[PDB]
Structures are given as structure tokens and as C-alpha cells.
A paper describes a structure:
FtF histones are defined by their predicted tetramer structure. In the tetramer, two dimers interact in a manner similar to nucleosomal histones, via their α3 helices and the last  ~8 amino acids of their α2 helix. Unlike nucleosomal histones, both sides of the dimer interact, forming a torus. To confirm the predicted tetramer structure of FtF-histones, we purified and crystallized the FtF histone from Thermococcus kodakarensis, which we refer to as HTkC. The asymmetric unit contains two histone dimers, that assemble into a torus-shaped tetramer. With a Cα RMSD of 0.652 Å, the HTkC crystal structure is virtually identical to the AlphaFold prediction, highlighting AlphaFold’s accuracy in predicting histone structures. For face-to-face (FtF) histones, which form the largest subgroup of α3 histones, we confirmed their unique quaternary structure by crystallography. The FtF histone, HTkC, in T. kodakarensis is part of the top 7% of the highest expressed genes, with an expression level that is 34 times lower than that of hypernucleosome histone HTkA. The α3 family compromises five histone categories, each of which is likely related to a different function as they differ in predicted quaternary structure and the presence of additional domains: face-to-face, bacterial dimer, ZZ, Rab GTPase, and phage histones. These categories are discussed in more detail below. α3 histones are defined by a truncated α3 helix, which, compared to the 10 amino acid long nucleosomal α3 helix, consists only of 3 to 4 amino acids. Residues R47, T49, and D54 form an RxTxxxxD motif which is also present in nucleosomal histones from archaea.
Residue numbers in the entry:
A (entry chain B), D (entry chain D): 3 to 59
B (entry chain A), C (entry chain C): 2 to 59
Amino acid sequence: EMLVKSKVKEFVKSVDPEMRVSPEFYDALEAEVKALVEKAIKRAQAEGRKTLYARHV
Amino acid sequence: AEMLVKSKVKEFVKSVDPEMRVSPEFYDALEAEVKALVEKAIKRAQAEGRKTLYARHV
Amino acid sequence: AEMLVKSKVKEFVKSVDPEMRVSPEFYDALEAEVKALVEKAIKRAQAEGRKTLYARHV
Amino acid sequence: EMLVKSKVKEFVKSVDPEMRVSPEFYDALEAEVKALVEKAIKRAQAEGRKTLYARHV
């Protein structure tokens, strides 16, 4: 798990004070973060690079 | 605030590509993209008139 | 099959960066990502039990 | 406009024959495609490239 659920909840509250987070949202968000990192790695590999940069995200 | 655990991101990267190193600013860029995903999810829920984020809003 | 007009993609790129050129493979990759965005929007609508795509599904 | 709305409609039908498309969906999809291309351009610029590749998408 790459996410801190309490910090996701706190961030959501900072955007919309009335917005709550379902337990299944955290799981779906975690899967999307994994997908972002896997895509970043594929961009770096396509370049022949062994370093991930901001521009690969 | 910061939603990601950088050590867990590093561990995940290693699980995909053992030889891949991570430039420090990648963690910050990944954090910004996760914030962007959550802000978009909030806009989807608000457009529906919901006060709860569901998996389908992501 | 193709949702994009390649000449219009090229024109848009030039409007953002006049010096930026477009490889043929970029158009194909962009087309695949647009299909992926629409498939994601369809899954959001289906999860909600809607039979219409709205702006908020994108 | 980069998208052909009739082709978007045809693609939606190919995925889900019962799914209808609101007029506002086409406009929202067009805005998201502009955002994808702007992000791709920023990735290429960050790399110091003057050509867009598949890996920039």
C-alpha cells in the first residue's frame, strides 16, 4: 500500500469539507497509483533509461 | 497533506523493475498526480450531488 | 475506428508549441488513449446504472 | 476540434450498444484530449525533444 488513508481523507476534507471517502475508494485509488507508476516505468524503459524522472509521471 | 509513502513507492518500483532508480522529484510529481486524480473524483461526485467518494468516481 | 483527425491533432500541437513535430506512432498512441478514456467513462456510467454518458463520466 | 463526434458515437456503440451519448460528453471528451496532448508536449519539452513519440502520451 503506497497511500496513507488518513492523509487521503484529510486532503479530501481540504477540497470539500462535507465530502466523505468510502472504504472502496481508497482501494480503487491505490490501483490507479500502481497504474501511474507502471506507466512511468514503461515510459523510462521505452527511452532506455534506468532513472524515473518527474516527466515520466 | 502528503498521501503517498515514498518508501512504499520505491518498494513497488523495485517489484516492477529491480534496476530502475527514482529521481527525488518523481515522488513529488507522483504526489501531485494523485492529488489531481482525487480532485477530479471530487468533481465527479459533486456533479452527481453525492457527499461520498465511491470507487467509480476515481 | 479512428475518433481523431490527425491534421487537427497536428494543428493543435502547433498552437501549443510551434517547433514541436509529431511522429506517426504518436497519433496511434493518442488514439488508443482516447479509446481508453471513453471505455473508462462507459464503466463509470455502467457502475452507476446509467444508460447515458454525461460530462461527469469523463 | 480534434474529435469526430459521429466516430465517438460509433466507438461507444461498439463497446455498449445500449449506451447513449449526451451532447456535453463530446465537449468534455474534447477538453480531456486537449489536456492529454498538452501533457504529452510538456513531457517532450522536459526531455528536450522537438518530436512527440508514443511514450509521451
